[PDB]
Symmetry: C3
Subunit: 174 residues, 3 copies
């Protein structure tokens, strides 16, 4: 069975990220450019800080027709002591995409399926919906609150941005 899990990834610009290694033949982004990154991750209902994303975007090409870039991305999503999910696939700055769920650990051991990536504000706000298969158990209720509908205006709960106990999961990843 599929268990839907939604999360918001927010770049609050306080993690030295993105770091752009610029090597391409072109002034614009192009093959050769690498972007290691790490953003914050919140629950789909925006009530709690869960952890971080972490990994590498490999630039594949500039896409002038779409005024954007194609990256190939390899990264993980960290949920404090619950574990993590890993993914691989396309990040297009100009449109939504789906990535492969390559596996997980902790409660996410056995994870497979795909995840939808929706960019809400370039490059600071993204919304994901994992269509998760393979998990041993139902997801914890803490993570499965009704998601806030995605739009450019979303913000995590103030207590979650503030790292108050009510706004974080235990040992949220940082």
């Amino acid at each position: 069975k599929v268990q839907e899990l939604s999360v918001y990834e927010i770049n609050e610009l306080d993690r030295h990220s993105p770091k752009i290694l610029k090597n391409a033949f072109s002034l614009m982004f192009g093959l050769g450019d690498l972007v290691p990154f790490t953003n914050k991750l919140y629950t789909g209902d925006l009530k709690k800080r869960v952890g971080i994303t972490a990994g590498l975007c490999v630039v594949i090409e500039h896409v002038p027709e779409k005024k954007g870039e194609r990256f190939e991305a390899t990264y993980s999503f960290y949920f404090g002591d619950y574990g993590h999910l890993s993914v691989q696939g396309p990040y297009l700055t100009y449109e939504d995409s789906f990535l492969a769920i390559t596996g997980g650990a902790g409660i996410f051991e056995g994870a497979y399926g795909q995840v939808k990536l929706q960019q809400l504000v370039y490059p600071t706000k993204l919304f994901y919906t994992f269509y998760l298969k393979g998990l041993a158990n139902d997801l914890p209720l803490e993570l499965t609150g009704t998601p806030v509908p995605p739009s450019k205006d979303i913000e995590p709960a103030p207590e979650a941005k503030a790292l108050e106990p009510s706004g974080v999961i235990s040992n949220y990843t940082n």
Copy 2:
């Protein structure tokens, strides 16, 4: 149940690829050298352009006794509107290898198994056979035409090279 899917990956020299990021203290490839890449991808029967490969080869070592290199590769195969497959594992310039199928998306959601990489003409032509498990449905017929047996002299159909509708899949990746 295994569904075999074969494709040809061709470097037509028009995608700025490969891009070599040099760090090893050697005239030869060595650990430290990174090689982002993206080549064109055609059906196993060579009749249609499907998309591209995209990702990163990490040089592991030069192998003088084999006159070649070992890379560790993490990358995806894009099939236009159908989705993508992702892989991880060894690319040896000097011999065939098997890589892990880490997952997929679109029609390839749930994909697992291994893929055989056959190096046909270095560095411009490779032939792959995915031994695909976990797919929801039989693959579309236009992807499963009897493959052209691999040889150094294979060429995509002229319609596929020229990007005519009869020689491409819908929204073929570029």
Copy 3:
């Protein structure tokens, strides 16, 4: 059915590894720094050389309060003619972690699950415990011997370090 598999990873200083690609503006590791690496891999009982590890550590952040680093790692474990296992996940220099098994090839085709990483000497000796599902067959007995108790003092069997027939698996990876 889960099959447990333990192996030792040792940096014997003869593979040019690790290579530190320094891009962060600090003397400390930081986002931007990339570390391609490849170490030797021995059985859990330390009697046999099996192969190598090979891949890339991406620095995510320095963790000064823990006197260590967080990396996001993408790499494979090579077992000679047996095949390989691929992983994605966290490597923290200051505490044990679990990584996702993203897939495998050979006897490891269909592999999934998670793997524990335990550092014994930073960064030259590590001990892993794979929790493997999905395999077609029971693991070969030469890989499932009782592990040597993990400590900073572990050493491969003399025959294995010297690459004598009795101390290696067939076509052990190098």
